């Protein structure tokens, strides 16, 4: 790989500072979700709004990584209830947890109102990973449903699956919430997916020119940036994705104390990799 010297990685989409013309690990998907959700929920913990909340995770199955998320905050003493809702069955590793409610159901507008009624007036934190390759109509239907989740559940914060439809497959302008577009390390090599993180809802219009901007910015990120070795980085692995993961994991809280920040991140990465069975 090519070498580079960086003070920090790109954390949000807006920070990508170049574009490029697009051209055609074990269980890496669970690692991608676990890191982004650790990042999101740790930010909410820093703002002091996580304690006492109920996390409503829609599109959670199988959700093997969710067991690590729940165990992490449970051992920190943070009082969290989990509600995992998906039409498919969840990973059996999520069984036998009193603070984790497993729901086998595809959500619609009617069911969203019923769960809001039963959880009201407790704080709701929404995590959505719903999907269906998907067509642009599928994405528009998925993103419409995510808007319905927010307008009905009225969460204090939300993390939404966000991949803009490709410009050559455009159908119609649509609206998404305002928020920060978190970038995902260990995503597929040329994925353009991000997580929309919002702390509360004003809607924002997405156009075909935005789709072009997304496509070129994310290709430059995947083709150029993520194939760099950060030579100044003090870490056993200097590849950019590990550099990126390192900066996400340093916002994570820990019960154990460490002599250095590097020792803390190294412990966290080892803990995550072992649970996900990554060498
Ligand atoms: N309306 C809905 N209500 C409920 N779940 C819905 C929908 C719709 I539309 C789609 N999904 C679900 O989203 C998942 C996408 S991959 C998750 C991956 C998961 N986050 C993991 O950790 O492995 C599938 O499991 C699918 O069943």
Residue numbers in the entry: 1 to 24, 34 to 141, 147 to 214, 219 to 297
Provide excerpts from the study.
We identified several compounds that inhibited the VP39 MTase significantly better than sinefungin. Among them, three (TO1111, TO1116, TO1119) had a relatively small substituent (small aliphatic chain or iodine atom) and five (TO427, TO494, TO500, TO504, TO507) had a large aromatic or heterocyclic substituent. Surprisingly, the efficacy of these compounds was very similar (IC50 = 0.08−0.17 µM) and an order of magnitude better than sinefungin (IC50 = 2.3 µM). To confirm our hypothesis that the inhibitors use the discovered water-filled cavity we performed a crystallographic analysis. We used the same approach as with sinefungin and we were able to obtain well diffracting crystals for five compounds (TO427, TO494, TO500, TO507, TO1119). In each case the electron density for the inhibitor was well visible allowing us to unambiguously model the inhibitor although the electron density for the large 7-deaza substituents was less defined than that for the SAH scaffold of the molecule. The crystallographic analysis revealed that in each case the moiety attached to the 7-deaza position is located within the water cavity. In the case of TO1119 that bears the large iodine atom at the 7-deaza position of the nucleobase only the water molecules near the iodine bound to the 7-deaza position were rearranged. TO1119 that only slightly disrupts the water network has IC50 = 128 nM while all the inhibitors with bulky substituents had a lower IC50 except for the only substituent that is able to form a hydrogen bond, the TO500 that possesses a benzimidazole heterocycle. These results suggest that for optimal inhibitor binding it is probably important to disrupt the water network, but it is not important to replace it with other hydrogen bonds.
